[PDB]
């Protein structure tokens, strides 16, 4: 049974532009769409005009606004923003029926942060205080929510990829998934939930113990898979892999899909590939299994993703087109939005663990489905973690 009906279907968006939830800030409430980001820890909103924003937070209109008299600078891999710290009353209309006083970074300047047509005006960093900017004394939103209310210290995400392109009007009208705050809604998944420990509380860090491409072991020292860390990040589109793992994975994926030759630009994640309407050769592309450390000593489980997850639908014509949504990383493994689209992901902060189950909305075909299976006997899994 599904017990959180008020929060089911509260997300919109897509992997390439991010998934967002509606929130309100201030008194009277100012409605804004907010990017759900498990890869950062600041709550920040556009607070000044920007060409890609059609609304922004107006602090002078909020009776409950409190100025913290301090600036904040947040650089990300490519995008960045700077703003002014303050606090205000915050609510989530399709969330728990509570109002909390939270820190808000009012974005005054930004560069390649806001995305044209994404429909979001701010970001909700759901990770831990350790990585909050300027420092860990800036309480993240979720920490404030749990401290001020009876909301349990857990949230879960079901990101729903459509499996095809959504134009501007379609993406605004479509249900992009669910963020269940304080619980697990059992209607959002099939099979069982398997848990992996959160290695450390900064990013949502996990440990990958084995990798397979169509059942074939990538056969790398497991430390390579987590070099320098492995994280679950809804604020990044792609599955990102450490340089050496990416080189081994692409070589194996190419070998598995060898009946069709794709250009270098495709494997670099830059160029789209197209097939006549309905003819995408899903069967030629391999499944990818990531084995994760289990909660029981010497036990692991695996999550299996299809090309329907790692090939991101893009519009070109009546052709079905995609980009390869696996990228090289110099900052460790990133289980991005395309991977999370295959699963219902439980961020169980209370029990320092992350759960995975097959998503009720994952894209698949009549021959193969995503999977979450276990247990497997795995030795010396602690050695897989990088120091
Ligand atoms: C999601 C839509 C598509 N899209 C963005 C538009 C192309 C991408 O796929 C995309 C591609 C790449 C390459 C990177 C990122 C990215 O930086 N995402 C952040 C959120 C975000 C979402 C946005 F929409 C726009 C942003 F500017 C920022 C996460 O919080 C990171 C930030 N981190 C670091 O920078 C870091 C700090 C220290 C060390 C290493 C890394 C920590 C991990 N978590 C996103």
UniProtKB/Swiss-Prot annotation:
Changing residue 228 to N: Almost abolishes beta-cleaved soluble APP production. GO terms for biological process: amyloid fibril formation; amyloid precursor protein catabolic process; amyloid-beta formation; amyloid-beta metabolic process; cellular response to amyloid-beta; cellular response to copper ion; cellular response to manganese ion; detection of mechanical stimulus involved in sensory perception of pain. Residues 1-387 are extracellular. Its EC number is 3.4.23.46. Glycans are attached at residues 97, 116, 167, 298. The modification N6-acetyllysine is found at residues 70, 219, 223, 229, 243-244, 251. Disulfide bonds join 160-361, 222-384, 274-321. It catalyses: Broad endopeptidase specificity. Cleaves Glu-Val-Asn-Leu-|-Asp-Ala-Glu-Phe in the Swedish variant of Alzheimer's amyloid precursor protein. GO terms for molecular function: amyloid-beta binding; aspartic-type endopeptidase activity; beta-aspartyl-peptidase activity; endopeptidase activity; enzyme binding; peptidase activity; protein serine/threonine kinase binding. It is a single-pass type I membrane protein. N-Glycosylated. Addition of a bisecting N-acetylglucosamine by MGAT3 blocks lysosomal targeting, further degradation and is required for maintaining stability under stress conditions. Acetylated in the endoplasmic reticulum at Lys-70, Lys-219, Lys-223, Lys-229, Lys-243, Lys-244 and Lys-251. Acetylation by NAT8 and NAT8B is transient and deacetylation probably occurs in the Golgi. Acetylation regulates the maturation, the transport to the plasma membrane, the stability and the expression of the protein. It comes from the Eukaryota. Induction: Up-regulated by the Ca(2+)-regulated transcription factor NFATC4. It is found in: Cell membrane; Golgi apparatus, trans-Golgi network; Endoplasmic reticulum; Endosome. Keywords: Acetylation, Aspartyl protease, Cell membrane, Cell projection, Cytoplasmic vesicle, Disulfide bond, Endoplasmic reticulum, Endosome, Glycoprotein, Golgi apparatus, Hydrolase, Isopeptide bond, Lipoprotein, Lysosome, Membrane, Palmitate, Phosphoprotein, Protease, Signal, Transmembrane, Transmembrane helix, Ubl conjugation, Zymogen. GO terms for cellular component: axon; cell surface; dendrite; early endosome; endoplasmic reticulum lumen; endosome; endosome membrane; Golgi apparatus. The active site is at 37, 233. Its main location: membrane. It is an enzyme of class 3 (hydrolase). Residues 19-357 form the Peptidase A1 domain. Monomer. Interacts with RTN1; RTN2; RTN3 and RTN4; the interaction leads to inhibition of amyloid precursor protein processing. Interacts with SNX6. Interacts with PCSK9. Interacts with NAT8 and NAT8B. Interacts with BIN1. Interacts (via extracellular domain) with ADAM10 (via extracellular domain). Interacts with SORL1; this interaction may affect binding with APP and hence reduce APP cleavage. Interacts with NRDC AND NRG1. DXXLL motif is required for a proper endocytosis and retrograde transport to the trans-Golgi network, as well as for regulation of lysosomal degradation. Belongs to the peptidase A1 family. Responsible for the proteolytic processing of the amyloid precursor protein (APP). Cleaves at the N-terminus of the A-beta peptide sequence, between residues 671 and 672 of APP, leads to the generation and extracellular release of beta-cleaved soluble APP, and a corresponding cell-associated C-terminal fragment which is later released by gamma-secretase. Cleaves CHL1. This is Beta-secretase 1. It comes from Homo sapiens.
């Amino acid at each position: 049974r599904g017990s959180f009906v008020e929060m089911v279907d509260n997300l919109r968006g897509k992997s390439g532009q991010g998934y967002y939830v509606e929130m309100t800030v201030g008194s009277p409430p100012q409605t804004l769409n907010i990017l759900v980001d498990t890869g950062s820890s600041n709550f920040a909103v556009g607070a000044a005009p920007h060409p890609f924003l059609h609304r922004y937070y107006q602090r002078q209109l909020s009776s409950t606004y409190r100025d913290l008299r301090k600036g904040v600078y947040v650089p990300y891999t490519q995008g960045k923003w700077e703003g002014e710290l303050g606090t205000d009353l915050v609510s989530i209309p399709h969330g728990p029926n509570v109002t909390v006083r939270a820190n808000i970074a009012a974005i005054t300047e930004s560069d390649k942060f806001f995305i044209n047509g994404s429909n979001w005006e701010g970001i909700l960093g759901l990770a831990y205080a350790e990585i909050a900017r300027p420092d860990d004394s800036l309480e993240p939103f979720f920490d404030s929510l749990v401290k001020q209310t009876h909301v349990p210290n857990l949230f879960s995400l079901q990101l729903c990829g459509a499996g095809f392109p959504l134009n501007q009007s379609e993406v605004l009208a479509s249900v992009g998934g669910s963020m269940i705050i304080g619980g697990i809604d059992h209607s959002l998944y099939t099979g069982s939930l398997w848990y992996t420990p959160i290695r450390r509380e900064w990013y949502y860090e996990v440990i990958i113990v084995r990798v397979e491409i169509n059942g074939q072991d990538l056969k790398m020292d497991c430390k390579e898979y987590n070099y320098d860390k492995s994280i679950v990040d809804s604020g990044t589109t792609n599955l990102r892999l450490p340089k050496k793992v990416f080189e081994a994975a692409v070589k194996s994926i190419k070998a598995a899909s060898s009946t069709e030759k794709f250009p270098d630009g495709f494997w670099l994640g830059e160029q789209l590939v197209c097939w006549q309407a309905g003819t995408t050769p899903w069967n030629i592309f391999p499944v990818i299994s990531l084995y994760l450390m289990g909660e029981v000593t010497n036990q692991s489980f695996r999550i299996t993703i299809l090309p329907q997850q790692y090939l991101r639908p893009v519009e070109d014509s009546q052709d079905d087109c995609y980009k390869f949504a696996i990228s090289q990383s110099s900052t460790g493994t990133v289980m991005g939005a395309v991977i999370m689209e295959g699963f219902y992901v439980v961020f169980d902060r209370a029990r320092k663990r992350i759960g995975f189950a097959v998503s009720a909305c994952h894209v698949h075909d009549e021959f193969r489905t995503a999977a979450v299976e276990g247990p497997f006997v795995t030795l010396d899994m602690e050695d897989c973690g990088y120091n």
